[PDB]
Design a protein around this ligand. Structure first.
Ligand SMILES: *Cc1cc2c(nc3c(=O)[nH]c(=O)nc-3n2C[C@H](O)[C@H](O)[C@H](O)COP(=O)(O)OP(=O)(O)OC[C@H]2O[C@@H](n3cnc4c(N)ncnc43)[C@H](O)[C@@H]2O)c(*)c1C
Ligand SMILES: [Cl-]
Ligand code: NA
Ligand code: NA
Length: 490
């Protein structure tokens, strides 16, 4: 009662929603991306606040502290476990939903931009394009991802070999901490500014906006998508790829998508067909690339082309808030440091991807710029020595049909254990997977020991620094979820 009373004193009431508010279901559902988490059995927020000004965010946090109601912040809603808008067990929380804070102000001459966390990536990319056809920013492939969550957890895409992760190209932030105080880089200090850029969402406060450096791209880039079935020699070709691709020049990223006994090699090249073709002949002739495979286009056009296969619908693909695609979805991830034996590739393609409930596997090669950053320089530790990341993606589209895909996801993770990173088995924070472990709360604070179990998987040797920083900026563990950094205090 008095939490709401506090909010109503400080925030326009049209931006406040209780469970009985007629628009509450629509507002709650607007950026839910996973049909597992939209159904009535999920734990719902007591209130939703949709700020349009930073002062609204500050007021909400101050009210939450005064009346001990915790807040889950949502930007784009893509959290794989829905932790921006649901809790796993019954508890009281509010959602602060930033979708109305979505400005992107680009300074093309300075090659910088300020981007509100509630902007979607496609809107950031498009605003960059409205300023210049030869600037880019290296974040995700999916246009509807929120800036807030993507950057907080790192953020990587088809420019990762050239420019690393989104978070290491952030030059300032505007942030509201657990006491409602407004911060920038200067006021935050080294530890807090280090942590917020890749240490995961929620834990380190609400980022209102991010200042980014914009990076050059040529006026023409080249994409190809070359498929090889196992009959066409996919196993020998991917067995070669895992060694070659992480060693290719920084201008060339060749990822793989597999969803059966067939691998599709998808390349983004910062250059022309004219120079790509000989580069392929020299470094990876086994793929059989020729100029007919080239698709030359602008960098901005590559975003819908890589993700959707579209060539012709730039604004519709990048400016999209309809939320039409809502699979039931499960996700896992791994990092690989040693080449798979050929027999493992055989099993993946011929056996694991031909099972009931089998998902899709996406393989992103590292090396070059992402791997040149030291493991501790940012919270994102998956750097030197990484050959590739794996994402295991399971989509399905009917309720009551989760058993088979959930079992496959578990079973293939077990099969892969001997071949991927270990001690710890590394995972990407933004591919959130609650089965890696969850927090225990004791005396209303997430425990360090419970956090460490999953925390070392996402953050390796950076976990303890993250937790000490958490202890300094949020000792009472106000901003938390079931898999957020616990405070480690004296
Ligand atoms: C759905 C989806 C996700 C993708 C896709 N492709 C990706 C890619 O090409 N590269 C990537 O690096 N990641 C990709 N992912 C995963 C996403 O990056 C993650 O799912 C992001 O965490 C999503 O961010 P967002 O859409 O903003 O999700 P939310 O659920 O709102 O938040 C996630 C997490 O972070 C906290 N949080 C949100 N907003 C803030 C702010 N402003 N400050 C601090 N913390 C914040 C939330 O509380 C929650 O814990 C492709 C697709 C289709
Ligand atoms: Cl996620
Ligand atoms: Na290891
Ligand atoms: Na999951």
């Amino acid at each position: 009662e008095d939490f709401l009373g506090c909010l109503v004193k400080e925030i326009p009431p049209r931006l406040l929603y209780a469970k009985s508010s007629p628009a509450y279901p629509s507002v709650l559902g607007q950026t839910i991306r996973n049909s597992r988490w939209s159904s009535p059995d999920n734990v719902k927020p007591l209130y939703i606040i949709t700020p349009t000004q930073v002062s609204h965010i500050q007021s909400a946090v101050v009210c939450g502290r005064r009346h001990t109601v915790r807040i889950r912040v949502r930007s784009g809603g893509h959290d794989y476990e829905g932790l921006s808008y649901r809790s796993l067990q019954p508890e009281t929380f509010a959602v602060v939903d930033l979708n109305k804070m979505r400005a992107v102000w680009v300074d093309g001459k300075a090659r910088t931009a300020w981007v509100d966390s509630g902007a979607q990536l496609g809107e950031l990319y498009y605003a960059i394009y409205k300023a210049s056809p030869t600037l880019a920013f290296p974040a995700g492939v999916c246009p509807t991802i929120g800036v807030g969550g993507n950057f907080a957890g790192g953020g990587f895409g088809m420019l990762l070999r050239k420019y690393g992760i989104a978070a290491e190209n952030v030059i300032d932030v505007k942030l509201v901490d657990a006491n409602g105080k407004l911060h920038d880089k200067k006021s935050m200090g080294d530890d807090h500014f280090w942590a917020v850029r890749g240490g995961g969402g929620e834990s380190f406060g609400i980022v209102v906006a991010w200042q980014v450096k914009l990076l050059p791209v040529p006026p023409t880039v080249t994409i190809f998508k070359i498929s090889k079935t196992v009959s066409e020699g996919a196993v020998d070709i991917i067995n070669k790829w895992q060694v070659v691709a992480p060693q290719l020049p920084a201008d060339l990223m060749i990822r793989i998508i597999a969803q059966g006994p067939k691998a599709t090699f998808e390349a983004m090249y910062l250059g022309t067909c004219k120079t790509l073709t000989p580069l392929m002949s020299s470094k990876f002739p086994e793929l059989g690339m020729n100029p007919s495979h080239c698709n030359e286009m602008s960098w901005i056009q590559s975003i819908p082309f890589v993700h959707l296969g579209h060539r012709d619908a730039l604004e519709d693909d990048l400016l999209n808030r309809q939320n039409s695609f809502k699979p039931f979805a499960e996700y896992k991830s791994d990092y690989v440091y040693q080449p798979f034996p050929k027999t493992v590739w055989e099993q993946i393609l011929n056996t694991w991807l031909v099972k009931p409930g089998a998902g899709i596997m996406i393989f992103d090669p590292y090396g070059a710029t992402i791997s040149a950053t030291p493991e501790s320089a940012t919270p994102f530790p998956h750097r030197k020595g990484v050959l590739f990341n794996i994402q295991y993606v399971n989509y399905w589209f009917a309720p009551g049909a989760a058993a088979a895909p959930l079992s496959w996801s578990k079973d293939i993770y077990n099969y892969m254990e001997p071949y991927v990173s270990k001690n710890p088995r590394q995972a990407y924070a933004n591919y959130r997977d609650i089965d890696l472990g969850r927090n225990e709360v004791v005396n209303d604070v997430s425990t360090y020991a419970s956090g460490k179990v999953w925390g070392q998987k996402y953050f390796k040797g950076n976990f303890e620094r993250l937790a000490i920083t958490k202890g300094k900026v949020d000792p009472t563990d106000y901003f938390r979820n079931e898999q957020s950094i616990p405070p480690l205090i004296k």
